[PDB]
Amino acid sequence: ASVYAWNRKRISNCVADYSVLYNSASFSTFKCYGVSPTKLNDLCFTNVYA
Amino acid sequence: YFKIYSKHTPINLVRDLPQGFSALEPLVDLPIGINITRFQTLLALHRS
Amino acid sequence: SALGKLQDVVNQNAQALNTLVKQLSSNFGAISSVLNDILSRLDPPEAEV
Amino acid sequence: LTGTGVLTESNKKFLPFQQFGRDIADTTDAVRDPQTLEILDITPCSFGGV
Numbered sequence: 001a002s003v004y005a006w007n008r009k010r011i012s013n014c015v016a017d018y019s020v021l022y023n024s025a026s027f028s029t030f031k032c033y034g035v036s037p038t039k040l041n042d043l044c045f046t047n048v049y050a
Numbered sequence: 051y052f053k054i055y056s057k058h059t060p061i062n063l064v065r066d067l068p069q070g071f072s073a074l075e076p077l078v079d080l081p082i083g084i085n086i087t088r089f090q091t092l093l094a095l096h097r098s
Numbered sequence: 099s100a101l102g103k104l105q106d107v108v109n110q111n112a113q114a115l116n117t118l119v120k121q122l123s124s125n126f127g128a129i130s131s132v133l134n135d136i137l138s139r140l141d142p143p144e145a146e147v
Numbered sequence: 148l149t150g151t152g153v154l155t156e157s158n159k160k161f162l163p164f165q166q167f168g169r170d171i172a173d174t175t176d177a178v179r180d181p182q183t184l185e186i187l188d189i190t191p192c193s194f195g196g197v
């Protein structure tokens with residue numbers, strides 16, 4: 001979607017492997033603010049939105 | 051998150067609210083993520 | 099209220115200890131008041147801050 | 148939720164919504180374990196002055 005009508009998707013009730021996101025070189029920018037990128041596989045979350 | 055807290059109490063007062071204390075237990079924690087500004091309750095008709 | 103003088107000392111000591119334990123729950127401007135959350139959530143460059 | 152302690156049986160009548168418990172320090176003192184739903188009390192490990 002466009003930036004004025006940005007699409008928000010809820011993510012819930014799943015087990016997420018973030019290691020395929022860190023190790024992928026396709027992303028020019030992979031920058032996290034409130035959490036470490038390498039610790040995402042060790043933590044549990046709710047209220048996940050994309 | 052839309053939180054619904056509920057409590058059921060056996061009462062015997064005829065018209066107004068009873069005077070007492072009853073804590074409402076949380077019933078449903080609901081993941082909606084939408085804007086709510088106005089509401090309306092639903093009643094049931096009786097047809098004879 | 100006969101033994102108020104001892105009770106005041108006991109209450110003041112307990113209240114000071116209680117406030118000291120309450121001070122652990124304050125983040126003091128950090129992201130969280132829990133050290134374990136910071137250790138599990140951040141890299142050392144931000145964790146040191 | 149991370150922490151250190153001894154997990155023991157408990158007699159605290161938790162309500163169905165209730166999952167964990169908190170002390171004055173806000174540190175977790177009892178927890179409900181996933182998968183088995185049991186309530187385990189958390190008591191801090193023994194320490195003192197040598």
Ligand SMILES: *[C@@H]1O[C@H](CO)[C@@H](O)[C@H](O)[C@H]1NC(C)=O
Nearest residue numbers: 166179180181182183184185
């Ligand atoms: C899996 O977890 C759910 C809720 O946490 C529980 O109801 C269920 O019994 C668990 N299954 C097993 C096999 O432990």
